[PDB]
Amino acid sequence: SVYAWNRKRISNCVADYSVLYNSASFSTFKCYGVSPTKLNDLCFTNVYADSFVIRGDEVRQIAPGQTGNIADYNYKLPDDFTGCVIAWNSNNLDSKVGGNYNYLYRLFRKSNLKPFERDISTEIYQAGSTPCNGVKGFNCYFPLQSYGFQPTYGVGYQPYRVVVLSFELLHAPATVCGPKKSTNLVKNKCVNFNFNGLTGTGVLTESNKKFLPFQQFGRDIADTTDAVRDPQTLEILDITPCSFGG
Amino acid sequence: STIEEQAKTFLDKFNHEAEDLFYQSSLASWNYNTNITEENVQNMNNAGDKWSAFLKEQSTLAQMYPLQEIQNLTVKLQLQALQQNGSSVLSEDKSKRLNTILNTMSTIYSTGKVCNPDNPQECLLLEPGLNEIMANSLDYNERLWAWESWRSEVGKQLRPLYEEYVVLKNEMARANHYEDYGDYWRGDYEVNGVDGYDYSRGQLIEDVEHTFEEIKPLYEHLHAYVRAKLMNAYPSYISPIGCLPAHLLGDMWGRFWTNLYSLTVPFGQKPNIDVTDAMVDQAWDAQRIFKEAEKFFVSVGLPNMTQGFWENSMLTDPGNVQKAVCHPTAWDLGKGDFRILMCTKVTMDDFLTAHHEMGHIQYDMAYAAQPFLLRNGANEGFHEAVGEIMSLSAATPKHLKSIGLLSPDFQEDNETEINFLLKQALTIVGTLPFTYMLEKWRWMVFKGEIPKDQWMKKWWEMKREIVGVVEPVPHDETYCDPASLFHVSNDYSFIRYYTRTLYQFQFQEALCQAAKHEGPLHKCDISNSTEAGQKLFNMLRLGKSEPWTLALENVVGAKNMNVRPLLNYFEPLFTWLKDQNKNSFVGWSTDWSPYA
């Protein structure tokens, strides 16, 4: 639900944002702190996923500096938020011909919801001065109401699935990041290489020395790299500077 | 304890279930109308009782709120309807007696049976039959008998029921802080908001009749013309100085006079506006007709028609086993759902009717952002007027030529345009005086200023002067002409039908005023005119949020109700009929009668 929006922690993996961006089945995908093109380039510690199904009209309400029945009581999003949200039509999945009543939204709240805060309380809302013992009466109401998603509901009213991606930058080591570029191995030509940050120019040949199962690269003396193990076939290469002279 | 803030919470709580339950009821009604079956009959009541019982407790809660200090105009307007409990102002016995008398008054009308004297077992009903006997025929005996049977076997048996119903309805209306019952009907044409735009029920009463005297030269001449032509049609039946009976009107009540257009055609050799061969030649089925009309709607500037309408709506004939009504209806089930229910046929009249239904759809979706209690027209006379504006704009030969329907070398001129305008006027200005006198009669019957003896003898002796239709036969007070009507047994307001067309013409003038179109008003077209949309757009989205007094400001500068376009639209027909009625004296002498 939206007042009880689920929270999932994603860390210690690689994120495939390209397949998420290229997909054309997503109704809404807009954000400003990070442009989607460069999202795979730079990465953070971990991410938070919040999945809930909302009405089509309310989709625009989930944005920084917004207020509404959802943006103020069911979910509050801080103005300094980074990342963005994926919304897509789910009328044929979430809704049913008899009317989906399995989703609920908070309508009343004495205190406005705080950013990145979820309130699961179901206290009997009180408006007037009448003493109510948790029972409905003159002006004592309920903070939660239900969705009535139906297949015959028009656009802006059909059940749309919405996943909020919250990005955070703790001082702890970053875990989730983007993929590689791979390219292709070429030998016996003065080229330049970037083997896991081992940036440098040279010519790569085949060698015969044996690394123990845990080294990554060797060196000989005066701290100059002399051999590298490729991270794909686990073979020992060699490095020679392409010639120069007067 | 504040009341203003908690009123909004109560409104939201009421709405959250109000839209849902109204949507369920609308879906059930559409299901029943689309396909009828025994199962789909009892569920209608099973939903209607719940919907009605939902309206009682919300108004029950709408008495503890002191609606005298709430400052928000929107909140005050919204809770004004909330305090309206409805029929809970009298005793339960009186309420059930009134419900029973309404039901029996409707059923007696629904069981009308009149048989021919020669064959005692051959009766005819409101279905095609005795109504058609005097609708399209050239006779004076069968028409006389049919009208006599209708006015004697219907209305006379309903007389005591109406007698009790009038006083009961007046009494229950008095308990709602109302001086009468007609005041409740006039409450729609009433605003108590901003100063300078305020309106009163008595203001409506006076302004609905000060808008009637400006059409006297337009009407009387026409009457004389009709009378004059009736002289060439029915010699030695009516004196040239008198007035015609109700049998020759063409309808059981003479509301529509277009049935005599073909009989009284000036130039019968000139063909009328016919495109039937054009409709059938290239197979104009219902879908492509609706799509071309939608293209015209887009050319007006209206928002794009919503996807899914082509799917849910059943455009064609319902079929053979799935019985359904053929009443042209445009359903707005809510929550973004729109549908249409019509028995489509390839006619120009059905073309205009489809235009009307889609105009209703557009107007309905115009105020979708309103709260649950504000998705209604600012008055009764905008929905029908908005729908009929499109019908009026779709009949111009300019648009018909623009859609490849008429020959490019056509010879439209003054004679055929005058004939078409006469056909239009027999429907347009052919209803004003009878409607006005009917509504006035209902009003002082509601008021009670006329006693129990001046009810039926007054009806004809005032119809003689308001319209000019002679009493074909002697009658006593046991007769009741008005009771033999659709909008008298179901308690339906009829004043809407008076201003409605006027609104059209006002808009039909005002838009034309903002159209840069030179020539006659009838030939004025709004096709390919984006500027003609936004003026309308400034009011359609208003809905019931703003009173109609201020709503009638973005289209017409004048906020009053002055009858400008009736003397503006029908200028050539009137100036040609002045030439036509040079010798025939206009007006009717209320002394000649068939019996004396």
Ligand SMILES: *[C@@H]1O[C@H](CO)[C@@H](O[C@@H]2O[C@H](CO)[C@@H](O)[C@H](O)[C@H]2NC(C)=O)[C@H](O)[C@H]1NC(C)=O
């Ligand atoms: C990553 O690199 C390749 C990518 O597929 C895989 O290793 C080779 O996989 C191919 C077929 O997928 C085999 O024919 C080779 O024999 C594999 N070589 C080695 C050295 O594994 C595998 O998915 C990954 N390999 C490693 C070492 O992580």
Ligand SMILES: *[C@@H]1O[C@H](CO)[C@@H](O)[C@H](O)[C@H]1NC(C)=O
């Ligand atoms: C309306 O929507 C239809 C369906 O996509 C489209 O073909 C058409 O171009 C739209 N017209 C306008 C004016 O938006």
